[PDB]
């Protein structure tokens, strides 16, 4: 189910809790919010404050707060007052463009990957009434392209241009407390490097934690998809693709992944825990001069319903300005050979 | 060197070409080229330009030159081939060239021109002058001027459209240019209608012929319409003239009387509404509007140096009438001021001289005759080492 919001790229997107509204940046300095009226999409809000292209947006479901970051080095937390969204400046203390942003599951913090080769972990102090941030620097040597939180809201996965996928502890004792141990490690002091991939090839476009967080997956520019298993001493399963690089990835079950990128269509990957092996299980987009729904690279994928444990519907936005909604059961019906786990 | 530079001024209905130093152009030809219509062999050389191109049976006539729509560069380039090798008979590698561009022509077009001149014709040096600026230089020949200046208001009126162009220190103030939908052709048509409603025995297929001739031989600008009309209605024997042409069909003679149209034709410059339902601003008002839109500091100088260019500014007393009318509008404005509240009186001067018809070519010929011209031209050596971009800017000189 494809819908064209515009002909230029949708830089990034974010859905609210009930999936009734979608926020998109139209290759702009702005963020447009849409909502369905019957079977039509209608623009309901226009968030204008950034003085640079917005590169990341995330929506905190329960608190209903939207956070955005842009090339203007700024980050803004938007709060809805009546019929209008109002922004609050958050100083990241960086001198290069911000690239990505994600609220933690507990909605007490949000992280911003940047070109300052650092990750800004921001949180609110109801003491001075403003947002502050601590940096996670070592050993990031390049621009941070992607981020994804662990369900415990402490561990944070990051992908950067220095070809690495890392897992850090974003532990902030003043908004949460001593996290329970995890197969990733017992010691989680702030900024602690828990894990670092062992490849020196390909920028890491996207990272994603499994529903339980014992697994982390990432896609790089070298046309590979990887998965680190914390229950197998962080053993890494890799799979080299025969096609173009993937830019986004998400778990749909503890052992299944859906990714998309420059090929312009979503694909399925499965993880065999026993063999510790990754396997390609199919094109999910089965039928300008392209046979895919999207007519340009797909840059972001998000789970709409079912969570990362048993996803039933997921979303994709791309550089073609289009947004697609995929139904997992429908896909299984149209493809009798489809796996999933 | 012992050889004079080539001066080529391309109009919309006339190209003026000749060598620098001469007072008049050696040739004045229609800016048209006749071609035959996948070229093979030497088909590209099968063309004619100027008069030789207006009436050729097996050929189609084009005017690749206008204010309106786009330059056909292929045709412009071929047009130049004969200008150089057929009419001027100049070895292009031995002569520096001075070409003219309209004001508001783009830098890109200047590079396209240089590409043709340097890469096709191998010229040693090239200079692209802006028409309005040459027109000003041309007025330095006037008895009314004592100091050379490149600040003034140029009224260029040919056969298509009339332009009011303000120039300051040698550079046209592009953002303040205004155009008028009244020119030679419009005058001809109006005179044509006037004859249609009064005279008989005029061959339809020869309607324009008579009109254009009447205009060129008997038209002029009068100080007042009623007083003029009264003049004609009283002493008709010495105001009404007669014209006689021959019927292209039957070879017999037809004679017509020429009257009111003599002064009514050129009058539409001052009273556009007479023939144009979509334009009513008198030329005097357009000039005032332009100058008032320019920087206050440059105004008075513009009022003091209004120059004419083009055959349509050639009517007897065109300048006198412009100067008078403009002085009335401006004096009237300063009248209101005093009353409301002593602004120094503004000196309005419309310059007319003997080289008006081809003021642009003459200005170019005089300037290309000086040593300085060779200093400012862009040489083939620099075109080659630096690129066509150097032709984007052509330094003003001569003052």
């Amino acid at each position: 189910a494809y819908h064209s919001f515009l002909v230029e790229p949708i830089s990034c997107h974010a859905w609210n809790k009930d999936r009734t509204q979608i926020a998109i940046c139209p290759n702009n300095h702005e963020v447009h919010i849409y909502e369905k009226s019957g079977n039509k999409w209608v623009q309901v809000h226009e968030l204008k404050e950034h003085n640079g292209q917005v590169t990341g947006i995330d929506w905190a479901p329960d608190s209903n707060r939207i956070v955005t970051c842009g090339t203007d080095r700024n980050a803004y937390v938007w709060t809805l007052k009546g019929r209008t969204w109002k922004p609050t400046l958050v100083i990241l203390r960086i001198n290069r463009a911000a690239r990505c942003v994600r609220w933690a599951p507990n909605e007490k913090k949000f992280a911003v990957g940047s070109g300052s080769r650092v990750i800004s972990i921001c949180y609110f102090e109801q003491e001075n009434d403003w947002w502050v941030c601590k940096h996670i620097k070592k050993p990031i040597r390049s621009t941070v392209l992607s981020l994804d939180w662990h369900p415990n809201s402490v561990l944070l996965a990051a992908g950067s241009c220095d070809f690495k996928c890392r897992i850090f502890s974003a532990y902030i004792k003043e908004v949460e407390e001593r996290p329970a141990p995890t197969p990733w490690g017992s010691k989680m002091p702030f900024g602690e490097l828990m894990f670092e991939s062992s490849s020196s090839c390909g920028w890491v476009h996207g990272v994603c934690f499994s529903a339980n967080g014992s697994r982390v997956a990432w896609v790089s520019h070298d046309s590979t998809v990887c998965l680190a298993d914390a229950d197998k001493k962080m053993a890494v399963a890799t799979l080299a693709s025969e096609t173009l690089p993937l830019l986004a990835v998400t778990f749909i079950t503890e052992s299944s992944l859906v990714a998309a990128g420059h090929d312009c269509f979503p694909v399925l990957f499965t993880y065999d825990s026993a063999a510790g092996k990754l396997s390609f299980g199919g094109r999910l987009d089965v039928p300008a001069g392209l046979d895919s729904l999207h007519k340009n690279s797909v840059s972001q994928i998000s789970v709409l319903s079912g969570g990362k444990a048993k996803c039933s519907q997921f979303c994709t936005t791309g550089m073609d300005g289009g947004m697609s909604i995929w139904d997992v059961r429908s896909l299984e019906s149209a493809l009798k050979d489809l796996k999933i786990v | 060197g012992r050889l004079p530079a080539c001066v080529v001024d391309c109009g919309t209905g006339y190209t003026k070409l000749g060598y620098a130093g001469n007072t008049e152009p050696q040739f004045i030809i229609p800016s048209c080229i006749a071609i035959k219509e996948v070229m093979k062999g030497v088909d590209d050389l099968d063309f004619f330009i100027g008069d030789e191109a207006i009436e050729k049976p097996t050929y189609a006539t084009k005017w690749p030159i206008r204010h309106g729509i786009v330059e056909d560069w292929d045709l412009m380039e071929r047009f130049m081939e004969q200008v150089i090798f057929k009419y001027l008979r100049a070895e292009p590698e031995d002569h520096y060239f001075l070409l003219t561009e309209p004001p508001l022509n783009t830098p890109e077009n200047r590079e396209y021109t240089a590409e043709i001149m340097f890469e096709s014709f191998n010229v040693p040096g090239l200079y692209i002058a802006v028409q309005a600026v040459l027109a000003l230089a041309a007025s330095w020949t006037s008895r009314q001027v004592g100091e050379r200046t490149l600040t003034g208001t140029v009224i260029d009126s040919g056969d298509g459209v009339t332009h009011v162009i303000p120039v300051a220190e040698g550079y046209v103030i592009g953002s303040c240019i205004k155009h008028i939908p009244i020119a030679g052709r419009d005058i001809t048509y109006f005179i044509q209608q006037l004859l249609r409603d009064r005279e008989v025995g005029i061959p339809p297929e020869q309607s324009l012929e008579t009109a254009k001739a009447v205009k060129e031989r008997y038209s002029y600008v009068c100080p007042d319409l009623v007083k003029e009309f009264n003049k004609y209605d009283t002493d008709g024997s010495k105001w009404i003239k007669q014209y006689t042409g021959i019927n292209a069909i039957s070879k017999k003679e037809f004679s017509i009387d020429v009257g009111y149209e003599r002064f009514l034709g050129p009058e539409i410059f001052f009273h556009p509404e007479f023939a144009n339902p979509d334009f009513t601003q008198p030329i005097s008002e357009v000039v005032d509007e332009v100058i008032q839109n320019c920087p206050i500091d440059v105004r008075r100088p513009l009022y003091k140096n209004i120059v004419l260019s083009g055959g349509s500014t050639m009517f007897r007393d065109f300048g006198r009438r412009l100067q008078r009318d403009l002085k009335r509008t401006v004096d009237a404005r300063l009248k209101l001021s005093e009353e409301l509240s002593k602004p120094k009186p503004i000196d309005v001067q419309v310059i007319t001289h003997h080289m008006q018809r081809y003021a642009v070519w003459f200005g170019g010929s005089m300037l290309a005759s000086t040593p300085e011209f060779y200093q400012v031209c862009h040489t083939k050596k620099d075109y080659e080492e630096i690129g066509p971009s150097i032709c984007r800017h052509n330094p003003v000189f001569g003052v």
Partner: protein
Amino acid sequence: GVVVDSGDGVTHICPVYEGFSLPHLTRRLDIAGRDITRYLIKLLLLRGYAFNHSADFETVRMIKEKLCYVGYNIEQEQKLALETTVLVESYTLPDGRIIKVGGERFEAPEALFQPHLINVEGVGVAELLFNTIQAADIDTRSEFYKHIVLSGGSTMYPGLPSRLERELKQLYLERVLKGDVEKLSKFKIRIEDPPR
């Protein structure tokens, strides 16, 4: 600490100590917004666009604000302008005409660092900033170097805080470290260039 300020009239590098400012150690730059707009007019003229200094000043000012920026490495910027078209941007004039602007985007502001370009004597905002801190108190040099902050329209040029940073590294390495690459690493520079 130092607060490099520049407007549509003049530029100022004002050193301030705990409390307050100190006239001695305060210098002004003879180049500002208007001078850059003027230089842009000269540059556009060389490109074939003859804008009148008075009649079109505001138009060229708007062109400057929308397209102008500060080059980081002029050698590299010039290569981009001469070998590619990635710097060329179209700009619509009030009368509808569309012009193309390129290399002149970074050339105009460069006057801030090379005054001679517009026939002005001096050493450039950067070298000037350096001399002000180098001559000042020794017990504040370090502190000053990361408490330099900007303000005034003529400082919002993309890449300005960066160009400044690089120019100071070059000066410090040559006129303070003698050229000892192996010690620049530990020369801390931090340009405060806030959001309001």
